[PDB]
Amino acid sequence: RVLATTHYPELKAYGYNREGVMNASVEFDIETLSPTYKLLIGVPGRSNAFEISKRLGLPDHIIGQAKSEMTAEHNEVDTMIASLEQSKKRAEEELSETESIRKEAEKLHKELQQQIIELNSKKDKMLEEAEQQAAEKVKAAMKEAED
Amino acid sequence: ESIRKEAEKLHKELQQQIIELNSKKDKMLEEAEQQAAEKVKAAMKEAED
Amino acid sequence: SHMVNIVGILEQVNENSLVLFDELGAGTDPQEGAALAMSILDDVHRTNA
Amino acid sequence: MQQKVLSALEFHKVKEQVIGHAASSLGKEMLLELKPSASIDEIKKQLDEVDEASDIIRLRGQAPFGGLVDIRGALRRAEIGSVLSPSEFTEISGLLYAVKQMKHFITQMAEDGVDIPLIHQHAEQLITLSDLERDINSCIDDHGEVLD
Amino acid sequence: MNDTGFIRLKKARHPLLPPDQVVANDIELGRDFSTIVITGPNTGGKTVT
Incomplete structure (x- = not known):
């Protein structure tokens, strides 16, 4: 039984290529810049370095240049994880x-x-009170007729 | 959703x-009060007759 | 913390500056770290620091 | 299991959070020696016992253990025919007093719905040792008027 | 308890973290898969997991 941890864009994909292996990650909230510590079984961990850097004030032209040094596959993977995670x-x-x-x-x-x-309960009580009052009045009228 | x-x-x-x-409560209470009042009035009229 | 300090350095650096950088872009995905590091080094290098 | 792994994970600190929840030193003696094992059946018995006792401590009363200390040296010194001190007799008296209050506590707890067999067995294992208790309460006191 | 090497810690909490800061996780291993790899940057409490 193995549990392993990594930050390498190779091992982001390691378990999906293998029988009997799971790939997971532990969630990060970029909007608070804080870990949620929530274990996402089946979902691999996106990198957010540029988005964190932007939220910390790094200039958009440096981020734009650094994103041009990345492979086309890198930029797809972390975007697909962001779309899954947002869904x-x-x-x-x-x-x-x-x-x-x-x-x-x-x-x-x-x-x-x-x-x-x-x-x-109120209806039954009012019907019973009305039947009692009717019976008392009939009894009073019968007594007056007898008199 | x-x-x-x-x-x-x-x-x-x-x-x-x-x-x-x-609304049905208020109406059923009013109908019960009216039926009680009519039974009372019919019993009074039959006594008067 | 490194990124906040680097942002503060980038606001103030000039041709008359020394700049010392230990492991630029560490603590994240190595490819994004290396890409950040190259772009930061190019930004600073253009100042002739 | 590897003592270096237990040390590096602070497994002794996990045990310390349990040691602070013990009413006597006897549960601490069972906690200090606590380590992982691969026996299965004794593991299953232990976790079933803390689950059952968790249902007791969540639904019923708290088991009293005040005045309960260890009498190992006292019982061994009394066994070899060496005459004890009244402090050893006081420890044995507090032990039998705790036996009495635990008997009373299970006697009160047994009147509800569903009686569990383990605590009932531990109750009926405790025997009436109240003659020795009355002898100690009438014999180690420092006022001589009862000693007469 | 089992001898099949199977684990399912439902809403597992780290035993030495404060109860007000500890996030509860479903951790399961040794059934459909024998290995988990926890991927991503060094932020998430991967070590705590």
Whole structure:
């Protein structure tokens, strides 16, 4: 049983070429410049050096030149991971909204069930009070007719 | 997104059912009060007759 | 931290400057690190520092 | 297992977070010798025991262990016919007092739904050693009026 | 516990990290694959994992 770690653009691809091997990564949030420490099984780790450098103030002409020293395959891989990761972020955010709506719907359903029980109980009580009052009045009228 | 649309639809339907249940409550209370008042009045009239 | 310091160096360097750089672009993907390092060295080299 | 790997991963610091949660030194004696093993069955028994005890400590009461110390030197010195000090008798008395309070605690815990066999077995293993306890409480006290 | 060398730590937390800072991870090994390689720059707590 092997768990290994790497930062090499060769081993970004290592496990997909192999039977019985998994490639993974641990997620980084560029927007906070902080690791989320979240293990993504099946998703390999993009490099973000230029995006971090830009967020730290490195000039766009230096980043543009450095990106021209890279191979065409490098620039595709980290962009595809960013598109996957953004699609996953969208799924997670839209799910968090969906969980909020589901909790509100479940609460509203419990409130409606409780109101239906209270309504039936109030109705039965008012019918019983009305039947008692009718029976007392008929009994009073029968007594007056007897008199 | 499909589950969200179903949950939002169900939430709107439940909100509408709460409004309809509150309206039916108020009407059923008023109909019960009227039927109680009419039974009282019919029993009074049959006694008067 | 290196990148913040490098940005601060790039704002201030001139032909009358000494600049000392240890392992430019370390702590990231080696290809992006090497590409950053070459572009930073070219930027500084043009100042005749 | 490799002691250098246990050291480099701070596995003794993991054990220290458990040692701070012990009510007596006896659980610390079982924790200080704690190391990984490959036996399977005794591993499974141990993790089932802490799970069952986690259900006790999450749902039921806390097991008292106050006044409970180790009486190994005292029991060995009493066994070879060497007359003990009243401090050794005090340690044995606190041990039997803890035996009594643990018997009472399982006696209170046994009235709920679902009785577990391990804690019930540990309760019925504890025997009435209250004659020795009453003799120690009436014999090692420093006021002579009860000693008479 | 098993002798098949199989691991599935559901929402695993590093035992020496603070409970308010520790991120919980599903870690699974020794079933569909015998080797995991954790790829990417040295930021993510790869060592902590």
